Amino acid sequence: AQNPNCNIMIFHPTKEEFNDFDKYIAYMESQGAHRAGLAKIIPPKEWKARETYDNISEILIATPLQQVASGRAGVFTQYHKKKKAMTVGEYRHLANSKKYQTPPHQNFEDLERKYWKNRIYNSPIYGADISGSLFDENTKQWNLGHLGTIQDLLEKECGVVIEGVNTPYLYFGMWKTTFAWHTEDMDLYSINYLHLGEPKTWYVVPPEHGQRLERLARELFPGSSRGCGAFLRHKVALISPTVLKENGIPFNRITQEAGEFMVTFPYGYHAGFNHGFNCAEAINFATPRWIDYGKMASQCSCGEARVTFSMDAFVRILQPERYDLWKRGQD
Numbered sequence: 001a002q003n004p005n006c007n008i009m010i011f012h013p014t015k016e017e018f019n020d021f022d023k024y025i026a027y028m029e030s031q032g033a034h035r036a037g038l039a040k041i042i043p044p045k046e047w048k049a050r051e052t053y054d055n056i057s058e059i060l061i062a063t064p065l066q067q068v069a070s071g072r073a074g075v076f077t078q079y080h081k082k083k084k085a086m087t088v089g090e091y092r093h094l095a096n097s098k099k100y101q102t103p104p105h106q107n108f109e110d111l112e113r114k115y116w117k118n119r120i121y122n123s124p125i126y127g128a129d130i131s132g133s134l135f136d137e138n139t140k141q142w143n144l145g146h147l148g149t150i151q152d153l154l155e156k157e158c159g160v161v162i163e164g165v166n167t168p169y170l171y172f173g174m175w176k177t178t179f180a181w182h183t184e185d186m187d188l189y190s191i192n193y194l195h196l197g198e199p200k201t202w203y204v205v206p207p208e209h210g211q212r213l214e215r216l217a218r219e220l221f222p223g224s225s226r227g228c229g230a231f232l233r234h235k236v237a238l239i240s241p242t243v244l245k246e247n248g249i250p251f252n253r254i255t256q257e258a259g260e261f262m263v264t265f266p267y268g269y270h271a272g273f274n275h276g277f278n279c280a281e282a283i284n285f286a287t288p289r290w291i292d293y294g295k296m297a298s299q300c301s302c303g304e305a306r307v308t309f310s311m312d313a314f315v316r317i318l319q320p321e322r323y324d325l326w327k328r329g330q331d
């Protein structure tokens, strides 16, 4: 078995190897990359996502989210308070202000220390889940707006034709902006490209150990756990690396820098934070190996997690028994 310790692998494809997305994903998994739940892909030195980022300030962040934390430094929830719309220009200016900017620090490790020590005492503002793309339409390789769609994958593998579309989302982050512990909708893959700015640190639990994370989360967030059998789908819970180590949860960590891709694999729980002003683009995707994960994925039926138009059809076809009660939570 490849990668038995489930370490995060880092790939350096050639421009030749970067031409066929599906085949490179299949390659990574032949080397055991999926066992970690997360891989990094450094694009060939000749590749670019677009020529410059000079004109992005006019993107609108229609609903910035102020991420308000409750709990203790290593175990907290966050609630997203909706703020007034602002442009990316305005946001970047806000991220760079004295109140919100990245503090002085020695290196990534010192900054990680400061994040976990001090996160709860500040409420950074996140521009998340904005439909759109920053890839140039002439970028042909690893263009997150030109991937084959999950609906087409399900059609090719399973023969069923469904409604729905699959498009990317932009995330504008600042220091301390946080993504809580989650897997993807329907335990899909994700791919994330860091277009510009400061890094993003990731924590990940190997898919084969995901249930151990869930068991800890039920113990750490006991009221949430009673309210919904899949409350991690709410994307509100944070657990520090220190806490994970204390409870023997297997995990890994890695820092993504501008110009790099990350791929999360089915049922790879991940969480993380932003080091400073940045912009990432991400999208979900599927492969043939995903299908069984999609069949077994948990669902939020309490009605908090409230998920896309396209997810309906995945639940309808892959989880027909759930379909009934799940759409009660989604209606």
Ligand SMILES: O=C(O)CNC(=O)C(=O)O
Pocket (backbone or CB within 6 Å): 171, 178, 179, 190, 191, 192, 264, 280, 282, 283
């Ligand atoms: O970048 C972020 O804020 C969150 N991204 C993801 O969870 C992902 O790409 O799967």
Ligand SMILES: [Mg+2]
Pocket (backbone or CB within 6 Å): 055, 056, 057, 058, 059
């Ligand atoms: Mg613009």
Ligand code: NI
Pocket (backbone or CB within 6 Å): 182, 183, 184, 190, 264, 270
């Ligand atoms: Ni994710």
Ligand SMILES: [Zn+2]
Pocket (backbone or CB within 6 Å): 227, 228, 229, 230, 231, 233, 234, 300, 301, 302, 303, 304, 305
């Ligand atoms: Zn729920």
